[PDB]
């Protein structure tokens, strides 16, 4: 509660002082972990905002390219949506050891299975081909973008856990060690005093005996 409740002793002083040094060292090392996570978090934040901005422009261009494909082809969306079987793009999970914390990152995997070739409506193949490329690039950006968000909220959780532990060391564990140590120091001086009293009285009693002998 308020004290570790170790009986006052010189041994307790040594243990408590070593315990305090350990707690202070842990506090400083965890504070550095938090600072490293906070810098990385903010960096991820800078890239994610700029990436989010870029995503806007890239998706706009892809959406426009679709308009051109539709202009030429007419209604290709019906065939594309219905005639779906296997993917050409797949995402493999990878681990990135950014710091003590390990974060999940996505990695783009070009599986290789061929996409559908469609020249059925007005044979608008070139516009569909440019459209494939524009969205293909869009997906690659988005994959990167998820590795931002998927590696980001995990940093916010890691920071909250680290800071909570650091705060407890600072607000709970060390104050408690310092109160215990100060308690020990005071009680040991109290024991020193009662020894002083008895020794002083012993010296006076010896003096009285000596006077009686004269």
């Amino acid at each position: 509660k308020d004290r570790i409740e170790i009986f006052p002793s010189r041994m307790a002083q040594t243990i408590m002082k070593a315990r305090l040094k350990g707690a202070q060292t842990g506090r400083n090392l965890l504070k550095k972990k938090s600072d490293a996570l906070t810098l990385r978090f903010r960096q991820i934040l800078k890239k994610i905002i700029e990436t989010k901005m870029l995503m806007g422009e890239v998706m706009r261009e892809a959406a426009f390219s679709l308009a051109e494909a539709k202009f030429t082809a007419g209604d290709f969306s019906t065939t594309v949506i219905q005639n779906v079987n296997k993917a050409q793009v797949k995402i493999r999970a990878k681990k990135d050891n950014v710091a003590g914390v390990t974060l999940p990152v996505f990695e783009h995997y070009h599986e290789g299975t061929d996409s559908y070739e469609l020249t059925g409506l007005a044979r608008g193949g070139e516009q569909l081909a440019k459209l494939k490329r524009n969205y293909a690039k869009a997906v690659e950006l988005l994959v990167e973008l998820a590795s931002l968000q998927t590696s980001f909220v995990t940093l916010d959780e890691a920071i909250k856990i680290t800071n909570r532990r650091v705060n407890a060391i600072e607000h709970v564990i060390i104050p408690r060690i310092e109160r215990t140590l100060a308690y020990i120091i005071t009680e040991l001086d109290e024991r020193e005093r009662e020894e002083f009293y008895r020794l002083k009285k012993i010296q006076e009693k010896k003096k009285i005996i000596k006077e009686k002998s004269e």
């Binding site: 959406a63 679709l66 969306s77 949506i81 797949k90 996505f106 869009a138 980001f152 995990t154």
Partner: protein
Amino acid sequence: RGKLIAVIGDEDTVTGFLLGGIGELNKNRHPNFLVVEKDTTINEIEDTFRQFLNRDDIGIILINQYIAEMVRHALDAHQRSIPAVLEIPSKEHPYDAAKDSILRRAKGMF
């Protein structure tokens, strides 16, 4: 092999990505995508979104912003990392910026 990307969006958005080479059928003939039409209700969108969250094969989910507002409670309720959800501007709805889940997840960003 590892993970697929699920897409929930309007006709043009889904069509674009499918041409992008992303999206496929599962072994149970289920599709990892939904086309959201004007006649599609909230329960159907949410049921699809959740089922992707409960599927171990998906992971990144791509949605339109306007949809994110339609079923917004389902985007904040689940906090993990599999379901990395990216919100993209629809053909006509304008550039996203506000009400981004991640932008909220950090309150220190302009």
